[PDB]
Amino acid sequence: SKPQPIAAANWKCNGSQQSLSELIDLFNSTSINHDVQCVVASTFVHLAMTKERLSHPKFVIAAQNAIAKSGAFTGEVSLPILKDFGVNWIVLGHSERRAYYGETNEIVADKVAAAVASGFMVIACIGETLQERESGRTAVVVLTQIAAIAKKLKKADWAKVVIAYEPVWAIGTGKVATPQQAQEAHALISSWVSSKIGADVAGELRILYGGSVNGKNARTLYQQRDVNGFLVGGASLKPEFVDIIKATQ
Amino acid sequence: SKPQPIAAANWKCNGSQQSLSELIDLFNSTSINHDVQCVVASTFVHLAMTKERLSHPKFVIAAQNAIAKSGAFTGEVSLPILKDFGVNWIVLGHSERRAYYGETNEIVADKVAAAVASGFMVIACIGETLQERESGRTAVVVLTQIAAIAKKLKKADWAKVVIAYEPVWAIGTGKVATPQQAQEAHALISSWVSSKIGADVAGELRILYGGSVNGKNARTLYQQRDVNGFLVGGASLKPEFVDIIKATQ
């Protein structure tokens, strides 16, 4: 049987105090009857307001990135800072950061390891690009990405880890992975974890799908054996996020 | 005659709610006898707390970085998000971002132009490395950095620009520029602005020095003709920041 699902909102670099407040209010007013961990990853600027306003019991707040240590890193936010601020969840290695902001497999792995060491729950993102998919390299890409993360972790750290598989070609493009495509990738990742880390670890591991998840396509994706929830971008800034939460059963 | 000086605290990636609250309490209690714009550039996480707790009328809050536009930039903060949050000052192009986070002269220029277009007061950082300085390339390097910025601005926009000259070799190394070194660089920048933009513009431009500024060395730097204040790193997390403010009389 599947572990507890996660429905995670990646608001990315978006939102005003007014618009996010209206969203938070809708979330707060939503009854959710099944066990699902909901997560809202706001910009750093909005953490304070989100921490204050979001009261729904099934939701936790997350950051969208961090660096490992405090220090002379103008513009960046560190894990200790977030921890001191009461933020216990974090999205790391998002493909936008891998593409635009220099995050190699190793940089991601090191961030994930530091976050787990500090006690964070981490949604670690992996996934292939369009070119990688089209060139037939998906499997090696995703396995290499996760193996880099694993290299910096110990078996016990996996209880704090969540993997988000997001094919880059599905992010913001309207081109969602089919249920078959998502399952194929998730089953592959699960097989790797089971073999390298342990069957116990694989069984408890949540592998979330992301990339063009919406209220209409989520239910069918969630029916797949190795899909344990969703990392949602565009739809997470909308009321339909609640329909994605509802699809995780 | 000098324009209004600026004393800017670049807290970098540092601070706990408690430690920064204590610092803010000290700043709030400080009596400042002259016109000076004090600026506290906190991490994004701490903007809410700093905005609320700072009361001293001579202090404004600033961000330490941003990207131009909101959108699918996981982990980043945009100018409109900051503007919506009431943050109207920003530090851009800091050495650490140029060195660690891919900010080329052009990326910095575009950020500065976007910030000015959004209505921000911008502290735009320029400065040469140790190898550039020792090879006699200070002038071409520094002037090329400001020229990139100027390309993207119109004359009137300079009212919203503050230049921070921070030799990279002086950042966190304890090697403060001597008064002669600082003045030579600042005079070069001022002369370039006078030539390229306008004498009036150069006269009203604030050029701040940064790099190992502390309460003891601040005044001897402020005495220089073309030093209009400071961008302070390490010492801005300490009580002696008050002495740096006082040194701008």
Short mmCIF file of C-alpha atoms in Angstrom, two decimals, chain A residues 10-18 43-49 51 64-65 67 69-78 80-82 84-86 91 94 96-97 100-101, chain B residues 10-18 43-49 51 64-65 67 69-78 80-82 84-86 91 94 96-97 100-101:
data_model
loop_
_atom_site.label_atom_id
_atom_site.label_comp_id
_atom_site.label_asym_id
_atom_site.label_seq_id
_atom_site.Cartn_x
_atom_site.Cartn_y
_atom_site.Cartn_z
CA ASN A 10 5.47 25.42 -5.92
CA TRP A 11 4.39 29.05 -6.25
CA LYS A 12 7.72 29.80 -7.94
CA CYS A 13 8.54 33.49 -8.22
CA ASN A 14 4.97 34.72 -8.01
CA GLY A 15 2.36 36.34 -5.89
CA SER A 16 1.38 39.51 -4.17
CA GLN A 17 0.37 39.84 -0.57
CA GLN A 18 -3.21 40.24 -1.69
CA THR A 43 9.04 32.87 -2.21
CA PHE A 44 11.30 33.73 0.69
CA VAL A 45 9.66 37.15 0.94
CA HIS A 46 6.29 35.56 1.56
CA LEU A 47 7.32 33.01 4.20
CA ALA A 48 6.35 35.31 7.07
CA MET A 49 2.88 36.02 5.72
CA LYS A 51 3.45 31.13 8.20
CA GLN A 64 12.01 26.92 -2.79
CA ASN A 65 15.76 26.91 -2.38
CA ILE A 67 22.35 27.42 0.38
CA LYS A 69 25.46 27.75 5.39
CA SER A 70 25.05 31.33 6.43
CA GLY A 71 27.85 33.70 5.51
CA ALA A 72 29.10 36.05 2.83
CA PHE A 73 26.64 35.06 0.12
CA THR A 74 24.85 38.26 -0.77
CA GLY A 75 21.30 37.61 -1.93
CA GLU A 76 21.08 34.00 -0.76
CA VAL A 77 19.16 32.38 2.09
CA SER A 78 20.69 29.58 4.16
CA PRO A 80 20.03 27.80 9.35
CA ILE A 81 18.18 30.96 8.57
CA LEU A 82 15.17 29.05 7.40
CA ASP A 84 15.47 29.61 12.78
CA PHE A 85 12.43 30.93 10.93
CA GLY A 86 10.43 27.77 11.52
CA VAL A 91 12.20 22.12 -2.48
CA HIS A 94 14.32 22.27 -9.16
CA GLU A 96 14.74 25.88 -13.19
CA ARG A 97 17.69 26.10 -10.80
CA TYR A 100 19.34 28.77 -14.97
CA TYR A 101 21.25 28.98 -11.71
CA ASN B 10 24.78 44.50 3.88
CA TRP B 11 23.88 41.72 6.31
CA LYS B 12 24.54 39.15 3.59
CA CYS B 13 23.29 35.67 4.38
CA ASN B 14 23.25 36.09 8.13
CA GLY B 15 21.04 36.56 11.12
CA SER B 16 18.53 34.91 13.41
CA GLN B 17 15.30 36.58 14.37
CA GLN B 18 16.78 37.18 17.80
CA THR B 43 17.94 38.47 3.64
CA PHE B 44 14.61 38.06 1.94
CA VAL B 45 13.39 35.98 4.86
CA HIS B 46 13.99 38.80 7.30
CA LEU B 47 12.44 41.63 5.32
CA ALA B 48 9.07 41.31 7.09
CA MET B 49 10.65 41.42 10.57
CA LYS B 51 10.28 46.27 8.02
CA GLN B 64 20.21 42.06 -1.51
CA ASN B 65 19.24 40.79 -4.96
CA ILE B 67 15.43 39.11 -10.75
CA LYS B 69 10.25 39.67 -13.50
CA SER B 70 7.98 37.31 -11.70
CA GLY B 71 7.46 33.90 -13.21
CA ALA B 72 8.81 30.40 -13.33
CA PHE B 73 12.07 31.02 -11.53
CA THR B 74 11.95 28.64 -8.58
CA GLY B 75 13.79 30.07 -5.57
CA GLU B 76 14.19 33.62 -6.93
CA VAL B 77 12.53 36.86 -5.86
CA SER B 78 11.45 39.44 -8.39
CA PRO B 80 7.57 43.40 -8.43
CA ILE B 81 7.32 41.03 -5.45
CA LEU B 82 9.68 43.30 -3.51
CA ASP B 84 4.54 44.89 -3.56
CA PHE B 85 6.18 44.15 -0.21
CA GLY B 86 7.17 47.81 0.28
CA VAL B 91 21.70 46.09 -3.70
CA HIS B 94 27.42 42.47 -5.47
CA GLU B 96 29.64 37.60 -4.41
CA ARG B 97 26.88 37.35 -7.01
CA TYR B 100 29.41 32.75 -7.44
CA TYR B 101 26.05 33.25 -9.12
#
